Amino acid sequence: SVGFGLVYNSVAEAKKFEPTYRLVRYGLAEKVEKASRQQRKQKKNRDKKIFGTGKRLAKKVARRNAD
Partner 1 sequence: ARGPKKHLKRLAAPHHWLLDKLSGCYAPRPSAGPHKLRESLPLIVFLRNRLKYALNGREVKAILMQRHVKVDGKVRTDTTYPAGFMDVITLDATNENFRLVYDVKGRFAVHRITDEEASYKLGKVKKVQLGKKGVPYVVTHDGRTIRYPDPNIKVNDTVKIDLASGKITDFIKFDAGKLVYVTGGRNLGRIGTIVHKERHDGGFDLVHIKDSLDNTFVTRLNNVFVIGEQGKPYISLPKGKGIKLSIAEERDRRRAQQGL
Partner RNA sequence: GUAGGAUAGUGGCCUACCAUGGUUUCAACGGGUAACGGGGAAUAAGGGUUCGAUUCCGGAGAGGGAGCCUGAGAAACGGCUACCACAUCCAAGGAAGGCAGCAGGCGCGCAAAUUACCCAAUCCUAAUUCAGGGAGGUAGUGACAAUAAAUAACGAUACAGGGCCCAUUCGGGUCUUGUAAUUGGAAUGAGUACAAUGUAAAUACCUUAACGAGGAACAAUUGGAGGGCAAGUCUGGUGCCAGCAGCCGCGGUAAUUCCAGCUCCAAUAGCGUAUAUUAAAGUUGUUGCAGUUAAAAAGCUCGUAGUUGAACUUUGGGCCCGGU
Partner RNA sequence: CGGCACCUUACGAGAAAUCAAAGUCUUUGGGUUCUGGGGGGAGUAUGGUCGCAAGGCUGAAACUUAAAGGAAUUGACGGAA
- Tell whether residue 27 is a contact of RNA (CB under 7 A): no
| 42 contacts 36 by C-beta, under 8 angstroms | no
What number of residues does the chain have?
A: 67
CA dist., res. 19 & res. 28, Å (int): 11
Site size toward RNA (CB under 7 A) is 12
Name the one range near RNA by CB under 7 A: 6-14, 18-26, 51-59: 18-26
Our CB check for partner 1 shows the closer of 22 and 56 to be 22
* Near RNA by CB under 7 A: residue from 9, 10, 36, 53: 36
Closest CA to 11 of 35, 28, 30, 32: 28
Q: How far is the CB of 17 from partner 1 (least distance, A)?
A: 6
